[PDB]
Design a protein around this ligand. Structure first.
Ligand SMILES: CCCCCCCCCCCCCC
Ligand SMILES: CCCCCCCCCCCCCC
Ligand SMILES: CCCCCCCCCCCCCC
Ligand SMILES: CCCCCCCC
Lengths: 144, 156, 447, 240, 240, 96, 48
């Protein structure tokens, strides 16, 4: 939260990258560190490599490197996923009468719809486009 | 900024001399502001493009233009160790005692990054050595805090 | 949009883009999914993508209403737009792979040159690539350029003098301006986050920095302006790395007529003239298609050697095999004319299409040669007699299969593809019934 | 036993124990490795110019070579015969007591003034109506040089003088540890002690290490040479 | 709730009066971030990117997803509607549709062309039996080798039907010809007919294997695509 | 630790369960959250499934939930291992 | 084999009496004689 591209790279990206060792059948490792306060480290593997073994080996070396990351990043936490954005389909959820913001729509989809689509027969993975609600405290410096 | 003015900022920043020369011919605004208030002269001075600094000044570019925080091109040129751009700017009538919103002069910035030759040239063109920032620190105070004895000898 | 471009501005472009598609392409477009914030070169307030959903194939008749056509029309109308670089493009056949045409070049800082020096080494390669339009085209950086940012220095002496801890200063700043994730709460039986952040109107411009107050140890409320000093500088809003080291991804493609293999060989030559401590590597499709190239001749070699050896055992002859194997171009040339005339492309479907035509024309030839050779072996007939008896006996079944094919394909005469394998089999049949007799007699005369 | 599975099971159990371990031990990085007990090869690194010290060679190997060799498929464990550089603050207890300071005050000052802050953005989301610009706020970044660590303000005296970190300590780059010192035929060296990953091929891995070293050689400083003082693979290749 | 967060006590002043979080801040439920603004035809929008499970059916899963969304209909707030901006199901249906068309279409035309030349309904059924038997056979070999029903295997299977028709005609025509030119009974005519072509058909199986098998031994992305066409065609052709 | 069944379920069990979607050869998934603080989610797989790959695929999907869990739950550590419902034997110890 | 090791005992009463912290005593001892890994810095682009 609120980190610049350099802060992210110097504290997160370089630390995780340095610990990605002893992982089998690695070809290359590209990574991005941008001013949205986000990092992505894609480890691409040899063809015919067990993607389950390849993921757990990457997952494991991150966990031992988690104590080295900042307080705020450890708190947020870090996710490891298989990279194949080959979607079966994309279901859009809209509001026509203009009674709901995208925040209100995303939260409803997250609470009610998402978990049911996940349990549906033959569905491998489900990904919410947007986040569910968060308790926003909007501070006033004149009052503070 | 105009339609051409935008292409001059990108060209001045990049270092493409030929593109600037053609935009000077087509009457592109030499005083076209950035979002932060940087003229093409700022961008050329910062990224260190001597050719474009001279060509822009030739086409009546404001040498003492200042951004939203009061920094002139001489600040950017002195700060980042661009000696011959500091010479050209000071020759074409740049304010050597130009204070930004923090009261920082080009002498402060040159002293801090330790560009010894630029400090001498600034002093030669009549830089105020006794000038202070908002905190009350001279160019001399910056030199002893960094432990630059070569710089400390000059500033007195 | 350019550097320092806001979210409200990016939406106005996406609004005009969506306004165009639902107006000037109402016949073709079903919906526009406008996403301000995300881009495929980088993220931020100054980037957006518009995912355009079209109607059925039926509701868009002709080539004028296809993606390729709408794409070219769309880009022209968006060239009008003032402070934007907008352009449409079709999705790749396989979304899983990516673009899958041209090359993917990684320029690497190999000796801690820094960000500002690799920026220039990239610009030196980009400038050189521009001076070979005959070989390279669309050589661009796949990433964001450097932007203005607000450097703010905390005077450690002033903060200690007024009795203000750095923890309190950096937290007040980072929490207000950046936003701070505190802890979780439970909204209607579901875990959700709690973010503290400044109300929008107190965290916009540098003037607002002065309105923030940190409490000192003595009790006094110190304003942020008392112990802070700010200036502008240029830093990257998206830093890239490749195999641990800093990098910059460059995308491009071979110029019309030239192979993608040639384009890469020039890029390698141009890269070797860059400053010291600047390396390069081939990633993505370039890594894949370089692995393919090395194998190709070895697998072509095995194919022919095994074909030859299998025919040699069948006929009990080292020479007679060649009579069959010479039929390959006869099956191929029909498909090539059909492709070039109607204007198809040599793709993976077309290639397996050729292999089947070669396979079936070889199948026809193998029997013609087998019948011909057997007549000479068993019944002791002459070369020309046996060839003439063979081609007669095999004429009907070849024409039966060929008639079944052209009757099977001509429902397509969708019209463009309908002549592809149609024309490929027409010549394959017509030529093979005349040329295979020749091949057998020429080979058995020589050898 | 499948070694990949054996590692996952061992680490699954370690992950339960990890938070019970001291705070200092976790930050040094606990490593779980599957490998042979002995070395596949040693990759020696010497400087033929004499323009680099034994300390400098080890630092270069760690920062520009090791990580890539450690990532190579078939490499179980890599051992640096030396140590990567660290910002060494060498405290002087006479000078510390002179200004009424402790190692605690030195540690607090470094944590405060060698900070990589996340300060947010100007015109950030959600913005106000008719917002002008959008720019990253850059507060404090990590220190880069011994001189910057030098001018870390520890305290300000009553008269108005300043106590810097250079006044109460000698500040220099130097090994994270000073235990390992390598020498190749008398002259000073560093090196990588490479152990073969469980089950992986010796010869195929050796080739992949050479392939990765070959990509670095062009970008070496002046007179930095690779030497092969221990290699088991040539025997395997020639004996066959 | 927002009320509970509003009533968080920050301070108690000297006189006893209170300072709460609501007194110094606006409090509401909102998004985790406001970086993205999603719109679908200039209307507020979200969505679900769905991926197919390993060894699952794209048609069944798609239909099942639509069934679940249809049963959430009566619980939606006012204004909420489902839209399908992206869907790969349409293309899977067509790939299967063309194979079923080409099979039906082939069996009809072979029946016509067999009757146009041989001129008896008895001979026209032998192709109509053999072609279905081999295709069903092909699906079994695809399943055994562990392939799926996709565009590449199905448009490879379309090309295979062409080869299957030949093997059917080549055998029957040659029996009908031997019967015509020698006047032999159906049984002895077959024995002689097969005696003429059996060695060649085995030869063709090897020759076409030599053409199509090496295609599957490419590496990476290209090899994966080439394997789909290769195993479909060689299996179909070898069963024929 | 020191959390009622409800709070444990809402913050841990549901968070883990809702990411256990689409794992190879998963038959059913029984779970329980008690007043002591414990969670025990048991995923039973189709007969003949490789139990080692089954474990790996659960551990991968669990790491999606790990970031979302409470801080104290992560401090105690979360286990993923192959299980059995019945005791082979009980070995008693007395003092005579 | 076993070797001589400098045993040092901290009188808790005398520490509490003077008002010195126990953490200050152990950090001062541990940092000076053993070494304290404080945080990371950037040495020519790399984290150290
Ligand atoms: C008898 C030839 C068989 C060779 C098998 C490989 C065919 C596919 C390779 C196509 C490469 C063409 C590149 C333009
Ligand atoms: C998810 C993977 C399921 C595998 C299905 C295999 C079915 C095999 C049945 C046909 C066997 C034919 C053997 C020749
Ligand atoms: C490598 C295998 C070669 C396949 C060709 C076999 C054909 C042999 C024909 C022999 C005629 C006599 C049959 C008994
Ligand atoms: C492998 C081909 C051998 C050909 C030999 C020819 C004998 C006259």
């Amino acid at each position: 939260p609120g980190a610049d591209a350099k802060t992210v790279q110097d504290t997160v990206t370089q630390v995780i990258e340095q610990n990605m060792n002893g992982i089998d059948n690695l070809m290359y490792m590209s990574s991005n560190s941008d001013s949205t306060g986000t990092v992505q480290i894609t480890l691409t593997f040899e063809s015919g490599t067990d993607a389950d073994i390849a993921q757990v080996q990457v997952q494991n070396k991150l966990q031992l490197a988690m104590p080295l990351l900042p307080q705020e990043v450890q708190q947020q936490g870090v996710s490891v996923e298989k990279s194949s954005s080959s979607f079966l389909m994309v279901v859009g959820v809209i509001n026509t009468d203009g009674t709901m913001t995208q925040e209100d729509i995303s939260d409803y989809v997250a609470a009610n719809m998402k978990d049911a689509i996940s349990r549906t027969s033959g569905v491998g993975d489900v990904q919410l486009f947007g986040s569910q609600y968060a308790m926003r405290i909007w501070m006033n410096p004149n009052e503070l | 900024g105009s339609d051409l003015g935008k292409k001059l900022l990108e060209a001045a920043r990049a270092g493409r001399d030929d593109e600037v020369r053609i935009l000077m011919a087509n009457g592109a605004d030499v005083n076209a502001a950035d979002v932060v208030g940087w003229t093409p002269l700022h961008l050329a001075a910062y990224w260190g493009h001597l050719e474009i600094v001279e060509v822009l000044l030739k086409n009546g570019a404001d040498v003492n233009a200042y951004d939203t925080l009061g920094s002139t091109p001489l600040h950017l040129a002195a700060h980042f160790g661009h000696l011959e751009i500091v010479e050209v700017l000071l020759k074409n009538g740049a304010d050597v005692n130009a204070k930004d919103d923090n009261g920082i002069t080009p002498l402060h910035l040159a002293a801090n990054r330790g560009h010894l030759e630029i400090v001498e040239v600034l002093l030669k063109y009549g830089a105020d050595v006794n000038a202070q920032d908002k905190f009350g620190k001279t160019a001399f105070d910056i030199s002893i805090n960094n432990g630059n004895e070569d710089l400390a000898e000059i500033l007195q | 949009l350019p550097a320092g471009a806001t979210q409200e501005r990016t939406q106005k472009v996406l609004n005009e883009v969506t306004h165009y598609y639902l107006t000037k392409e109402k016949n073709n477009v079903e919906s526009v999914f406008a996403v301000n914030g995300f881009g495929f070169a980088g993220r931020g307030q100054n980037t957006g993508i518009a995912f355009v959903s079209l109607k059925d194939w039926a509701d868009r008749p002709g080539e004028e209403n296809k993606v390729e056509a709408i794409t070219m029309r769309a880009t022209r109308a968006f060239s009008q737009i003032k402070d934007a670089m907008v352009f449409a493009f079709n999705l790749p056949a396989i979304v899983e792979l990516g673009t899958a045409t041209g090359f993917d070049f990684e320029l690497i800082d190999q000796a801690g040159l820094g960000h500002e020096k690799l920026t220039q080494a990239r610009n030196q390669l980009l400038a050189e690539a521009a001076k070979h339009p005959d070989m390279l085209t669309s050589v661009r950086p796949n990433g964001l350029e450097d932007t203005p940012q607000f450097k703010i220095d905390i005077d450690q002496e002033k903060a200690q003098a007024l009795g203000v801890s750095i923890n309190d200063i950096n937290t007040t700043l980072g929490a207000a301006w950046g936003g701070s994730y505190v802890n979780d709460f439970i909204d209607r039986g579901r875990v959700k986050k709690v973010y503290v952040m400044s109300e929008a109107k107190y965290r916009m411009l540098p003037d607002d920095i002065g309105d923030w107050y940190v409490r000192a140890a003595d009790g006094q409320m110190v304003p942020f302006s008392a112990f802070s000093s700010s200036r502008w500088e240029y830093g990257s809003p998206r830093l890239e790395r490749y195999n641990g080291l800093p990098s910059m991804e460059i995308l491009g493609q071979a110029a019309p007529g030239k192979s993608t293999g040639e384009a890469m060989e020039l890029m390698e030559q141009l890269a070797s003239k860059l400053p010291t401590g600047v390396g390069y590597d081939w990633t993505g499709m370039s890594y894949q298609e370089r692995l393919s190239g090395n194998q190709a001749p070895s697998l072509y070699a095995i194919s022919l050697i095994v074909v030859f050896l299998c025919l040699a055992a069948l006929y009990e002859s080292w020479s007679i095999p060649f009579s069959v194997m010479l039929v390959v171009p006869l099956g191929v040339i029909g498909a090539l004319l059909a492709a070039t005339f109607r204007g198809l492309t040599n793709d993976v479907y077309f290639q397996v299409g050729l292999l089947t035509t070669i396979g079936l024309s070889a199948k026809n030839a193998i029997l013609i040669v087998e019948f011909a050779k057997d007549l000479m072996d068993k019944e002791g007939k002459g070369l020309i007699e046996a060839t003439l008896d063979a081609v007669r006996m095999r004429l009907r079944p070849i024409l039966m299969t060929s008639l079944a094919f052209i009757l099977g394909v001509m429902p397509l005469v969708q019209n463009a593809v309908g002549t592809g394998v149609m024309g490929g089999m027409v010549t394959a049949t017509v030529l093979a019934i005349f040329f295979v007799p020749v091949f057998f007699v020429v080979v058995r005369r020589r050898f | 036993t499948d070694a990949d599975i054996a590692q996952v099971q061992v680490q699954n159990k370690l992950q339960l124990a990890m938070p019970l371990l001291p705070q200092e031990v976790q930050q040094q990085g606990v490593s779980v490795e599957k490998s042979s007990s002995s070395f596949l090869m040693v990759v020696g690194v010497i400087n033929t110019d004499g323009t680099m010290t034994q300390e400098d060679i080890s630092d270069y190997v760690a920062a520009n070579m090791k990580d890539a060799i450690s990532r190579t498929s078939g490499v179980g464990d890599v051992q640096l015969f030396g140590s990567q550089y660290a910002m060494r603050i060498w405290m002087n207890p006479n000078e510390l007591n002179k200004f009424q300071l402790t190692p605690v005050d030195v540690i607090t000052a470094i944590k405060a003034q060698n900070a990589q802050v996340a300060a947010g953005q100007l015109g950030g989301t959600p913005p106000v109506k008719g917002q002008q610009l959008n720019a990253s706020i850059i507060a404090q970044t990590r220190l880069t040089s011994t001189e910057e660590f030098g001018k870390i303000l520890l305290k300000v005296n009553q008269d108005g003088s300043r106590v810097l970190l250079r006044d109460v300590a000698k500040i220099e780059l130097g090994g994270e540890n000073y235990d390992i010192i390598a020498e190749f035929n008398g002259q000073p060296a560093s090196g990588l002690g490479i152990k073969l990953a469980t089950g992986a091929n010796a010869l195929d891995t050796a080739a992949a290490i050479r392939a990765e070293l070959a990509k670095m050689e062009p970008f070496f400083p002046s007179g930095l040479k690779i030497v092969y003082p221990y290699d088991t693979t040539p025997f395997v290749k020639i004996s066959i | 709730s927002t009320e509970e967060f509003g009533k968080i006590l920050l301070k108690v002043n000297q006189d006893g009066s209170r300072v709460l979080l609501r007194d110094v801040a606006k409090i509401e439920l909102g998004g985790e971030n406001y970086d993205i603004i999603a719109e679908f035809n200039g209307q507020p929008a979200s969505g679900l990117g769905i991926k197919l499970a390993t060894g699952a059916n794209a048609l069944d899963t798609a239909a099942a997803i639509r069934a679940e969304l249809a049963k959430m209909e009566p619980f939606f707030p006012s204004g909420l509607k489902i839209v399908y901006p992206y869907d790969t199901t349409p293309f899977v249906k067509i790939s299967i549709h063309e194979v079923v068309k080409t099979l039906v279409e082939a069996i009809i035309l072979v029946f016509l062309v067999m009757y146009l030349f041989l001129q008896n309904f008895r001979a026209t059924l032998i192709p109509t039996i053999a072609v279905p038997v081999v295709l069903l056979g092909t699906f079994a070999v695809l399943a055994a080798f562990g392939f799926s029903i996709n565009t590449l295997t199905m448009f490879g299977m379309v090309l295979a039907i062409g080869l299957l028709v030949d093997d059917a005609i080549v055998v029957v025509e040659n029996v009908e010809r031997v019967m015509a030119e020698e006047g032999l009974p159906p049984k002895e005519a077959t024995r002689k007919s097969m005696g003429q072509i059996q060695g060649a058909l085995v030869g063709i199986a090897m020759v076409l294997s030599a053409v199509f098998v090496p295609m599957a031994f490419f590496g990476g992305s290209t090899g994966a695509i080439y394997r789909q066409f290769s195993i479909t065609i060689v299996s179909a052709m070898a069963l024929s």
